[PDB]
Amino acid sequence: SLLTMFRELGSGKLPLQIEQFERGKTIFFPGDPAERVYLLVKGAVKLSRVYESGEEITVALLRENSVFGVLSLLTGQRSDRFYHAVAFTPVQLFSVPIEFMQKALIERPELANVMLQGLSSRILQTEMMIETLAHRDMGSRLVSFLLILCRDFGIPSPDGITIDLKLSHQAIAEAIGSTRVTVTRLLGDLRESKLIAIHKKRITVFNPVALSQQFS
Amino acid sequence: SLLTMFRELGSGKLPLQIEQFERGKTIFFPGDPAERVYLLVKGAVKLSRVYESGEEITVALLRENSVFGVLSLLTGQRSDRFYHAVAFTPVQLFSVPIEFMQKALIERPELANVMLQGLSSRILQTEMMIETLAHRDMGSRLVSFLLILCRDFGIPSPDGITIDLKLSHQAIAEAIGSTRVTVTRLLGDLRESKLIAIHKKRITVFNPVALSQQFS
Numbered sequence: 001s002l003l004t005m006f007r008e009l010g011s012g013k014l015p016l017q018i019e020q021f022e023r024g025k026t027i028f029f030p031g032d033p034a035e036r037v038y039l040l041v042k043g044a045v046k047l048s049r050v051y052e053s054g055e056e057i058t059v060a061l062l063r064e065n066s067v068f069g070v071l072s073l074l075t076g077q078r079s080d081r082f083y084h085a086v087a088f089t090p091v092q093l094f095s096v097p098i099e100f101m102q103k104a105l106i107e108r109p110e111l112a113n114v115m116l117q118g119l120s121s122r123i124l125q126t127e128m129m130i131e132t133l134a135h136r137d138m139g140s141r142l143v144s145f146l147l148i149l150c151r152d153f154g155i156p157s158p159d160g161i162t163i164d165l166k167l168s169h170q171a172i173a174e175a176i177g178s179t180r181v182t183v184t185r186l187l188g189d190l191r192e193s194k195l196i197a198i199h200k201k202r203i204t205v206f207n208p209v210a211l212s213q214q215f216s
Numbered sequence: 217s218l219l220t221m222f223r224e225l226g227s228g229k230l231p232l233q234i235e236q237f238e239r240g241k242t243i244f245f246p247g248d249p250a251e252r253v254y255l256l257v258k259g260a261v262k263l264s265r266v267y268e269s270g271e272e273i274t275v276a277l278l279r280e281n282s283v284f285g286v287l288s289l290l291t292g293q294r295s296d297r298f299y300h301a302v303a304f305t306p307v308q309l310f311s312v313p314i315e316f317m318q319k320a321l322i323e324r325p326e327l328a329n330v331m332l333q334g335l336s337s338r339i340l341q342t343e344m345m346i347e348t349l350a351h352r353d354m355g356s357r358l359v360s361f362l363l364i365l366c367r368d369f370g371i372p373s374p375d376g377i378t379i380d381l382k383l384s385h386q387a388i389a390e391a392i393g394s395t396r397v398t399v400t401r402l403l404g405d406l407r408e409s410k411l412i413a414i415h416k417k418r419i420t421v422f423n424p425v426a427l428s429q430q431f432s
Contacts, residue, residue, distance in 0.1 A: 071339060124293070
């Protein structure tokens with residue numbers, strides 16, 4: 001899938017590193033030196049800004065075929081990490097040394113338009129992430145989060161929009177700012193409201209319009 | 217200065233609109249339709265996210281020759297404004313209809329690398345803006361803000377780093393989240409501490425290292 005990108009616009013040799021982490025493992029930490037640009041092959045990586053105290057606030061959840069840990073290079077000023085990249089699901093990654101990401105962007109500058117557009121979408125997702133976390137109650141906050149996952153991780157089904165993640169209650173909490181107890185109570189209150197289906201741990205939403213419209 | 221960009225990579229005709237607003241005037245509001253991309257010629261434009269309640273939180277302060285109101289176009293999904301653009305100083309702007317910003321990015325894709333890098337710097341500034349506003353006290357918050365202005369709006373002088381803005385006490389407050397009373401008390405407490413100079417309403421910082429190092 002990604003290799004198809006590489007094989008096109010290509011008649012050379014490219015150094016990279018495959019790396020595979022288990023769920024909940026740090027990929028890089030803020031402060032860490034940005035030495036290589038990352039490319040998500042399989043899985044989801046959760047980017048979160050770690051606050052100058054103890055706090056951690058979720059900034060973006062990244063889908064397959066997404067590029068990250070690039071901002072340090074692009075700026076040309078800052079030379080070390082911006083956020084805390086966590087393996088939300090198990091992840092397969094391509095680490096590519098900064099140099100080559102520069103060489104690509106120079107020679108094949110169409111790559112800039114694609115990555116320019118890709119970064120914009122990232123910000124929109126962060127904007128929805130901010131609007132999500134601003135709700136004072138955990139109910140409207142969960143809905144917003146699940147609506148984000150529908151728009152960016154949803155697989156259309158006659159059942160509904162399956163959120164293709166297989167995600168745990170405790171994992172949702174650390175992304176939303178609650179507990180694997182309030183999440184469990186809310187999801188049941190939604191399942192028995194005939195608005196959600198839970199198979200495996202995948203969550204299918206029957207109607208995103210109907211889910212959206214409850215301040216709960 | 218900007219015209220030099222236009223004249224190079226150019227052998228056609230380009231529609232735009234000059235527009236000039238007075239300080240504190242709205243350029244566009246969130247929700248407003250994104251119809252044309254903006255280009256700051258002279259002055260500073262303050263981008264602030266207006267919260268789903270009454271709140272307004274400052275996201276970026278833009279320097280001369282900076283491009284803005286582009287994100288809606290880049291995403292290709294959202295078709296209306298992201299933030300509230302305010303004329304921080306009096307501003308001269310170029311409004312360019314989205315179409316042409318697309319035509320430019322396609323034909324002259326080097327323009328993507330430049331704008332890709334420019335957007336990264338914007339995010340770094342927002343990251344410093346977040347770190348600025350996270351301080352519980354107004355003292356450390358003012359310092360961070362003035363340090364941002366030094367790095368992005370500073371003119372080196374044997375005096376020090378003059379923040380080339382001519383900015384009002386009440387204007388600083390609305391960007392920092394205080395009052396034109398606590399700002400006036402703090403600036404005097406810094407002037408008489410031999411750390412700031414105020415000429416006109418320009419603020420010169422003698423030593424950014426010395427200013428930085430006080431949790432006050």
